[PDB]
């Protein structure tokens, strides 16, 4: 499992991240995420407001307690304080910032976290305020380092001004690209990370309903790999910068994801990818 500078401030992950979100029957929760670690993968997902109670953190943190604390990458996150018919209300105040990652440190029972993310961005409070209780944080050694989730240019700028940020985590795959206008070229310029989340399941989703699509078959055929891996490869491919953190509950599917990292796909291959994504009578549809 090759490894990976994300960001520069010294954060080191493995190429392939882990999602915790979905695994919140512990026992076998545990053993997904042990295997993930048998496999190589040493970077680890999770947020408070996953589970119930913080209980993604929780399972996360007894895993933790089979594997070798040190050589593990914990993300996790705080800033969604409440959701309701009326939508997600997130808070950023310095007081918050640090009881939530109180909380976090103990429901994971660690003594840091290394990447710690704004889950989602208070516009009430200017992001100098939240970044100046993190950057607290870092000093301390509560936590390592900084991430920010779905936050505007405007955002990600004026927070690296305070504090570098570490990682940016943004939804894109093949079936969302629209971080590569703006956000992307953003994070490069800064040395920003990258952390694709949802990078295959909006894509599975989308392959269920259409099959309940031909062109990715064959392009994954042709590969050698399955369209999951192909759509994985894909993210992979697009930077050196590039973390995934695709979720699974099944062993089998943590295999397959682990081996899309063996696909190998030229810039040609990539495109032909993206634009495939905007007797007698014995013949097949043509692709
Ligand atoms: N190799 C694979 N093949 C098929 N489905 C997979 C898969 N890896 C993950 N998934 C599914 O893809 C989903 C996770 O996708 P994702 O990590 O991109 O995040 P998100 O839920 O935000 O879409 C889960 O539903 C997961 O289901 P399983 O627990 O049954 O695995």
């Given at each position: 499992?090759?490894?990976?500078?994300l960001?520069?401030?010294?954060?080191?992950?493995?190429?392939?991240?882990f999602?915790?979100?979905?695994?919140?029957?512990?026992?076998?929760?545990?053993?997904?995420?042990?295997?993930?670690?048998?496999?190589?993968?040493?970077?680890?997902?999770t947020?408070?407001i996953?589970?119930?109670?913080?209980?993604?953190?929780?399972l996360?943190?007894?895993?933790?307690?089979?594997?070798?604390?040190?050589?593990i990458?914990?993300?996790?996150?705080?800033?969604?304080?409440?959701?309701?018919?009326?939508?997600?209300?997130?808070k950023?105040?310095?007081?918050?910032?640090?009881?939530?990652?109180?909380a976090?440190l103990?429901?994971?029972?660690?003594?840091?976290?290394?990447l710690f993310?704004?889950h989602?961005?208070?516009?009430?409070?200017?992001?100098?305020?939240?970044?100046?209780?993190?950057?607290?944080?870092?000093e301390?050694?509560?936590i390592?380092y900084?991430?920010?989730?779905?936050?505007?240019?405007?955002?990600?700028?004026?927070?690296?001004?305070?504090?570098?940020?570490?990682?940016?985590?943004?939804?894109?795959?093949?079936?969302?690209?629209?971080?590569?206008?703006?956000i992307?070229?953003?994070?490069?310029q800064?040395?920003?990370?990258?952390?694709?989340?949802?990078?295959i399941?909006?894509?599975?989703?989308?392959?269920?309903?259409?099959?309940?699509?031909?062109?990715?078959?064959?392009?994954?055929?042709?590969?050698?790999?399955?369209?999951?891996?192909?759509?994985?490869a894909?993210?992979?491919?697009?930077?050196?910068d590039?973390?995934?953190?695709p979720?699974?509950?099944?062993?089998?599917?943590?295999?397959?994801?682990?081996?899309?990292?063996?696909?190998?796909?030229?810039?040609?291959?990539?495109?032909?990818?993206s634009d495939?994504?905007?007797?007698?009578?014995?013949?097949?549809?043509?692709?």
């Open positions: 499992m090759p490894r990976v500078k960001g520069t401030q010294g954060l080191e992950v493995s190429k392939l991240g999602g915790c979100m979905g695994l919140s029957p512990e026992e076998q929760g545990i053993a997904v995420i042990k295997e993930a670690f048998n496999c190589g993968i040493t970077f680890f997902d947020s408070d996953y589970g119930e109670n913080g209980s993604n953190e929780e996360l943190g007894k895993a933790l307690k089979q594997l070798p604390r040190e050589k990458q914990v993300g996790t996150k705080f800033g969604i304080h409440e959701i309701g018919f009326s939508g997600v209300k997130a950023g105040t310095p007081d918050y910032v640090r009881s939530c990652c109180e976090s103990k429901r994971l029972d660690v003594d840091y976290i290394d993310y704004i989602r961005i208070d516009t009430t409070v200017p992001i100098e305020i939240t970044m100046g209780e993190l950057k607290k944080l870092v301390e050694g509560k390592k900084v991430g920010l989730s779905e936050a505007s240019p405007d955002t990600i700028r004026r927070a690296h001004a305070v504090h570098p940020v570490t990682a940016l985590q943004i939804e894109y795959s093949l079936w969302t690209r629209d971080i590569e206008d703006e992307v070229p953003l994070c490069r800064l040395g920003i990370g990258i952390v694709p989340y949802s990078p399941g909006r894509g599975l989703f989308w392959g269920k309903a259409i099959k309940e699509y031909y062109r990715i078959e064959a392009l994954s055929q042709k590969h050698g790999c399955t369209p999951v891996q192909l759509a994985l894909w993210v992979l491919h697009q930077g050196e590039v973390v995934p953190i979720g699974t509950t099944k062993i089998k599917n943590l295999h397959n994801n682990v081996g899309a990292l063996k696909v190998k796909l030229t810039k040609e291959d990539l495109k032909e990818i495939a994504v905007p007797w007698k009578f014995a013949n097949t549809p043509p692709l």
